[PDB]
Amino acid sequence: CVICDPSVVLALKSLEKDYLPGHLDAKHHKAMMERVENAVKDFQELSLNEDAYMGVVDEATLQKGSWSLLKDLKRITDSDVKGDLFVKELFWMLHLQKETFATYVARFQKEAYCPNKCGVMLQTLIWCKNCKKEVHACRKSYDCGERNVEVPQMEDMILDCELNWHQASEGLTDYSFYRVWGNNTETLVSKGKEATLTKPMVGPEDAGSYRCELGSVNSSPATIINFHVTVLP
Amino acid sequence: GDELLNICMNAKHHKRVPSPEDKLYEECIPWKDNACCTLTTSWEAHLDVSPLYNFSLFHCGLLMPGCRKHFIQAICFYECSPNLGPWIQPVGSLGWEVGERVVNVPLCQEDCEEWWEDCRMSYTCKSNWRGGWDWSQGKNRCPKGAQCLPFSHYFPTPADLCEKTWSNSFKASPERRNSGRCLQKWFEPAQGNPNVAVARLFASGRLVP
Numbered sequence: 001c002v003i004c005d006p007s008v009v010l011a012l013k014s015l016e017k018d019y020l021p022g023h024l025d026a027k028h029h030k031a032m033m034e035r036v037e038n039a040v041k042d043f044q045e046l047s048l049n050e051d052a053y054m055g056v057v058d059e060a061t062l063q064k065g066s067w068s069l070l071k072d073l074k075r076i077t078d079s080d081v082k083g084d085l086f087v088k089e090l091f092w093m094l095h096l097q098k099e100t101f102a103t104y105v106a107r108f109q110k111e112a113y114c115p116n117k118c119g120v121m122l123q124t125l126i127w128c129k130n131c132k133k134e135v136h137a138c139r140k141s142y143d144c145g146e147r148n149v150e151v152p153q154m155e156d157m158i159l160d161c162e163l164n165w166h167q168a169s170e171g172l173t174d175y176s177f178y179r180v181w182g183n184n185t186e187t188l189v190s191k192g193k194e195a196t197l198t199k200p201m202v203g204p205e206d207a208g209s210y211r212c213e214l215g216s217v218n219s220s221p222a223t224i225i226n227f228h229v230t231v232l233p
Numbered sequence: 234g235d236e237l238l239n240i241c242m243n244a245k246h247h248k249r250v251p252s253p254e255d256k257l258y259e260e261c262i263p264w265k266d267n268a269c270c271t272l273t274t275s276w277e278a279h280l281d282v283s284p285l286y287n288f289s290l291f292h293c294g295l296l297m298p299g300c301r302k303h304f305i306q307a308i309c310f311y312e313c314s315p316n317l318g319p320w321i322q323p324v325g326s327l328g329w330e331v332g333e334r335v336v337n338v339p340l341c342q343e344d345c346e347e348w349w350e351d352c353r354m355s356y357t358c359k360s361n362w363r364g365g366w367d368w369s370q371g372k373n374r375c376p377k378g379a380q381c382l383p384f385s386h387y388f389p390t391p392a393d394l395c396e397k398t399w400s401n402s403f404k405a406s407p408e409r410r411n412s413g414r415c416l417q418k419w420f421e422p423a424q425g426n427p428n429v430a431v432a433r434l435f436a437s438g439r440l441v442p
């Protein structure tokens with residue numbers, strides 16, 4: 001995947017144009033760059049599976065991988081190692097950086113890729129096989145559960161629709177809260193970027209069912225939560 | 234009217250008969266007014282790996298979003314459309330007069346051309362998805378000697394993609410949209426469902442027993 005980073009592309013081009021001329025037989029340059037480019041290209045060849053690899057990374061992981069690669073590569077070119085020894089360690093370095101990259105990607109997968117344990121999260125990602133950056137839909141569950149809230153009289157009712165992943169998700173709109181009546185209808189109470197609804201100084205009549213609906217440009221909610229509120233005199 | 238109109242296939246998750254559905258999820262919304270799919274089913278049609286089928290679209294990794302979208306629509310169309318009547322057949326090679334599927338549902342050019350264009354730079358490893366997959370780790374994975382390459386490589390034309398992904402549930406019709414002789418797998422709801430008239434035409438057009 002690291003070849004999707006411009007710094008790496010640049011380092012390979014300097015390696016071919018600047019470094020090889022004085023550090024390798026001319027009759028070798030064409031065949032050598034073929035092999036190098038193929039070995040970098042091969043950073044994308046990780047065993048496809050969830051919690052390990054799905055053909056994508058986010059930008060941070062690409063950067064981390066790119067940084068590690070470039071530092072290792074520079075250590076070689078800074079040293080002016082020539083000929084047969086240069087080739088051996090270039091490729092052994094590549095082989096070792098690929099495993100180091102896999103290490104970063106596996107962490108990405110386990111921790112960063114579709115973090116949401118519910119709802120639908122929009123996440124920007126880079127596709128390792130084509131270097132295209134696009135937004136992906138992480139669909140976990142149709143709704144994100146129910147809540148039971150106890151709220152004494154004269155006390156403030158607070159319904160929190162925030163979820164740890166909301167901040168990071170992309171293309172979020174406005175939390176919308178609804179009051180859900182015994183009929184088959186509901187009424188809107190508030191919409192806005194307030195991730196919480198508050199009704200001050202609750203009375204017995206405020207008890208009932210509410211519901212938050214965090215909107216998305218996808219035009220299908222990112223988060224649906226149902227609150228069951230009881231007022232306990 | 235006609236016995237091949239407004240029916241659902243005797244299949245897995247399909248409803249007995251089509252009926253409206255207040256809330257249908259995302260891509261499967263155009264069939265809201267009259268649908269052989271349920272809500273649950275329409276959600277499940279949007280999943281990473283869908284519980285509706287044993288199949289993984291992400292065998293070479295994630296499809297690009299705009300490619301994935303076409304596959305979810307094909308699935309919506311397949312699970313929700315009450316206009317497939319004329320192409321409903323028994324499962325297995327054999328005639329009616331002797332468990333159901335659909336066979337050769339004619340998709341318009343544009344539906345297949347758009348699908349192919351948006352899937353151009355997504356990745357797969359097989360030019361025919363019905364067959365030699367490896368299932369040794371639960372879901373289907375790419376065979377030993379089969380490189381992940383662009384859809385434009387394994388599915389050289391739009392017809393190949395329409396046909397070879399889903400066992401000829403679909404055929405890539407030479408006809409274009411608003412010919413009255415092919416179905417769209419998706420349509421903007423604002424305008425009407427253009428497939429109603431197409432089913433009507435084939436139900437009474439196919440000289441059959």
Ligand SMILES: *[C@@H]1O[C@H](CO)[C@@H](O)[C@H](O)[C@H]1NC(C)=O
Pocket residue numbers: 181182183185
């Ligand atoms: C039914 O909807 C009406 C709308 O005005 C509302 O006033 C009423 O509270 C609802 N039913 C009940 C008894 O909750």
Ligand SMILES: [Cl-]
Pocket residue numbers: 314315316426428429
């Ligand atoms: Cl239809």
